[PDB]
Amino acid sequence: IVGGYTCGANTVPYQVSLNSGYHFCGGSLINSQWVVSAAHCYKSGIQVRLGEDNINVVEGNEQFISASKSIVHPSYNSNTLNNDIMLIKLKSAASLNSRVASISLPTSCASAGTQCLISGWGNTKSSGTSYPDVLKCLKAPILSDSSCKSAYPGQITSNMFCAGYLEGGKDSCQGDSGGPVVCSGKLQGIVSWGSGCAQKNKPGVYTKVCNYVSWIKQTIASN
Ligand SMILES: N=C(N)c1ccc(O)c(/C=N\CC/N=C/c2cc(C(=N)N)ccc2O)c1
Ligand SMILES: [Ca+2]
Numbered sequence: 001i002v003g004g005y006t007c008g009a010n011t012v013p014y015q016v017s018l019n020s021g022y023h024f025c026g027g028s029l030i031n032s033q034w035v036v037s038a039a040h041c042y043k044s045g046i047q048v049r050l051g052e053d054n055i056n057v058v059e060g061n062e063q064f065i066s067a068s069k070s071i072v073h074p075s076y077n078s079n080t081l082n083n084d085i086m087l088i089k090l091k092s093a094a095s096l097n098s099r100v101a102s103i104s105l106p107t108s109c110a111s112a113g114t115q116c117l118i119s120g121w122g123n124t125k126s127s128g129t130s131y132p133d134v135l136k137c138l139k140a141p142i143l144s145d146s147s148c149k150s151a152y153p154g155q156i157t158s159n160m161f162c163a164g165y166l167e168g169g170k171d172s173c174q175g176d177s178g179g180p181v182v183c184s185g186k187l188q189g190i191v192s193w194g195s196g197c198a199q200k201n202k203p204g205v206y207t208k209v210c211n212y213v214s215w216i217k218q219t220i221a222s223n
Helices: 145-151 213-221
Strands: 015-019 023-031 034-037 047-050 063-072 086-090 115-120 136-141 160-163 180-183 186-193 204-208
Touching: 015 034, 023 047, 023 180, 023 186, 023 213, 034 186, 086 213, 115 186, 145 160, 160 186
Parallel strands: none
Antiparallel strands: 015 023, 015 047, 023 034, 034 086, 047 063, 063 086, 115 136, 115 180, 160 204, 180 186, 186 204
16 A cells, blocks of 8 residues: 555454455455455465454464365456456454454445545555565545546456556555455455556556446355
């Protein structure tokens, strides 16, 4: 997260860190046994880490649980990142508490202008690299569809939306992939892609979660 702020320990209880020997992507807890992330974050041997703040220090509220199954969206296209969403089932149910909580799925899509909370352990530098260790946060509005498609001609699909600031300075970045975009208490987006980080007229692109609620619900209920 570039141009953001330190969230504060466990202030985003649904935020998870996917670990394969190191933090590599974010994710969102949707219920005690399931996490939603980006399909481009797929890999074997994933351990889901909940109740995390500083990812390099055991602070007392963590829960490390191995993934038992991963399900990349049936229509995921790695070249265009269309349908960049995947579900991860935990080998054992997470113990829900004030620091480890699920985030509700949307029942309808969000509108342009709506303010959302984006979080993650990604790079905090617009030019260069610096990884935080503690969770970073960023308030950003959903941009107009036209603004989004104008910034990324021919690349934006109905399953994507942009959020952030066209002036630049605030945006998600490498390492935030798979993380949550929450608006009005609903998980409306997943950190998917962008061009550089916090660059002018290059807002972040997010997976439009409201388009996948039926698939998410049906998939979890059948697995
Ligand atoms: N808003 C932006 N310009 C910005 C730019 C790019 C984007 O990545 C994002 C949103 N995604 C972050 C996840 N990155 C980690 C990651 C880790 C791995 C990995 N461990 N192998 C692979 C792909 C990965 O993407 C935002
Ligand atoms: Ca920790």
